[PDB]
């Protein structure tokens with residue numbers, strides 16, 4: 001079998017496609033013939049050797065994959081069945097998606113839903129699944145299209161792009177925040193009602209003027225701090241990222257004076273039930289047009305190059321990896 | 325009529341009980357003969373001139389009151405009716421409850437709930453109403469007694485005492501955090517199962533060991549930051565306070581890695597349906613023993629002295645003001 005393999009020569013990560021035997025695969029009760037994977041921000045860090053994502057080498061990266069079951073000892077899954085996986089430590093501490101074959105716990109798999117192609121599941125990937133979870137968080141908080149504008153940060157990215165399209169489809173007025181001017185036409189076509197510059201969110205008072213009924217944040221750090229200060233009374237922010245930094249230098253004022261909810265969204269260990277629900281919602285809520293707009297398809301050996309482009313913020317939308 | 329009056333000579337607030345004519349009260353549809361009020365942290369800030377709570381002088385402070393309607397131009401209220409009020413800006417921008425009479429909008433009043441005495445309504449006051457809103461937030465998040473331990477910070481105070489008593493009644497295992505060894509017996513008597521020192525909430529990593537299914541925070545600052553770092557995956561913190569400072573020096577990690585919810589709770593502008601629900605729940609969920617254990621009854625003339633004690637963290641439980 002072939003696989004993208006991370007090894008460490010002199011402490012610096014080297015990535016290259018290599019042949020290896022199925023016998024080397026980690027233990028698990030389901031074996032999957034992988035047809036598609038993707039590159040997420042976390043995959044890019046893993047591949048660039050940045051971020052301390054990988055604590056064991058050599059490692060097959062890729063926190064995502066979709067394919068067909070080769071063999072299964074889990075009674076929920078049968079040989080030939082179409083399945084997908086995102087998260088659960090896969091591609092971090094367990095051999096990953098960017099390989100022709102993977103062996104995992106059946107607990108980590110999701111049956112490919114009726115209404116979603118294996119290829120499109122990967123275009124969504126971890127990033128899109130996370131966006132769906134964020135949207136469901138706003139809904140849980142009672143945030144409706146009629147309540148006001150929803151703001152999306154890091155909007156041109158994988159999570160951001162998906163969130164814009166989901167919110168647009170669901171009827172919300174969407175404001176997209178982006179540090180790049182080249183992404184504007186793209187963002188408008190995704191459904192953004194207006195585009196705002198990243199520099200507009202540098203520093204804030206504890207409370208700013210109320211602007212947002214809802215927010216989906218991929219940035220963290222000072223951007224998230226300012227969004228919080230700008231939330232309408234009873235607004236909700238769904239936070240999932242740290243593209244701008246992991247710190248959260250905020251105050252309790254939006255919370256105790258404006259009754260704001262900050263809902264954290266984790267994709268790695270999302271419970272099976274909510275996980276299944278998110279995938280079913282994606283079938284319903286993501287327009288077929290999104291898949292053509294947001295995706296760039298690459299081959300396995302091109303991953304390191306794109307990993308680099310992702311870290312340097314030189315891409316927009318989602319990176320789909322054909323594994324075949 | 326008699327009322328506690330706040331005036332500032334030169335950037336400093338002066339508080340004294342004075343006699344005034346009823347005709348000096350602000351305009352409003354409902355005139356109430358006040359029988360009870362209370363002192364909350366916010367009232368103590370107002371009365372001591374700290375916290376920029378009052379921007380208009382002279383002011384009659386007191387964000388709570390309970391009494392009997394003398395006259396009403398509002399068709400929802402009638403002469404002789406028992407009513408209570410918390411919040412709505414009363415005691416901040418509108419002459420408030422620390423007086424023999426108050427005049428207010430019908431919208432700000434709550435008919436005295438069946439089963440609740442006027443005196444007990446004020447032992448509860450804003451502090452207890454807030455604790456109830458915090459408990460309801462944990463419930464909204466699906467935090468059940470079987471799910472794990474709930475921590476209450478600033479536990480010996482007004483909101484904290486009520487919170488401990490409510491959670492205890494509802495069947496939770498409760499941990500109380502206090503910076504005063506002298507409050508431990510009192511906290512145990514309210515139903516706290518575990519008592520921890522505030523000293524243990526001074527430094528923290530972005531993620532600490534997972535300890536709490538839920539939390540009710542009245543302190544903010546570092547204590548809140550560490551509580552966030554200690555939340556179980558999917559845990560919820562209901563935050564309502566700033567006794568320890570208004571800053572929130574935290575990181576996105578508990579949110580994006582552990583799916584934590586931080587729900588802000590405001591008592592001031594709580595809409596009528598939720599506000600009515602909270603009062604109904606309080607009547608049901610606070611044991612009779614609570615009113616006896618938590619309350620210290622003072623007269624209006626004692627208010628300034630007690631406001632000092634509150635700000636100096638030299639009181640425990642709830643301060644009840646007999647106005648009648």
Ligand SMILES: NC(=O)c1ccc[n+]([C@@H]2O[C@H](COP(=O)([O-])OP(=O)(O)OC[C@H]3O[C@@H](n4cnc5c(N)ncnc54)[C@H](OP(=O)(O)O)[C@@H]3O)[C@@H](O)[C@H]2O)c1
Pocket residue numbers: 040041042126127130153154155156157158159160177178179180183198218219223239240241242243244245265266267268310313315316317580581
């Ligand atoms: N389980 C989880 O909570 C989970 C799951 C998926 C993703 N994430 C996190 O969510 C974030 C987004 O992931 P992704 O895969 O969408 O990433 P991405 O496509 O690589 O980029 C996200 C966007 O963030 C913006 N950005 C990048 N650097 C920035 C900076 N220094 N300051 C402000 N904005 C910056 C860029 O948008 P613009 O150029 O338009 O400004 C970029 O397109 C990442 O931090 C990722 O690790 C977490």
Ligand SMILES: NC(=O)c1ccc[n+]([C@@H]2O[C@H](COP(=O)([O-])OP(=O)(O)OC[C@H]3O[C@@H](n4cnc5c(N)ncnc54)[C@H](OP(=O)(O)O)[C@@H]3O)[C@@H](O)[C@H]2O)c1
Pocket residue numbers: 256257364365366450451454477478479480481482483484501502503504507522542543547563564565566567568569589590591592634637639641
């Ligand atoms: N969100 C809202 O609409 C609203 C409504 C009501 C109350 N509040 C806020 O909630 C908080 C509690 O109100 P309350 O009436 O219960 O006040 P309280 O009776 O004074 O309780 C505050 C408690 O915090 C602890 N504390 C005091 N100073 C501290 C410090 N410097 N560092 C760490 N802990 C400290 C003390 O407990 P220990 O001695 O046991 O440590 C004290 O009992 C206040 O900040 C108040 O403004 C907000």
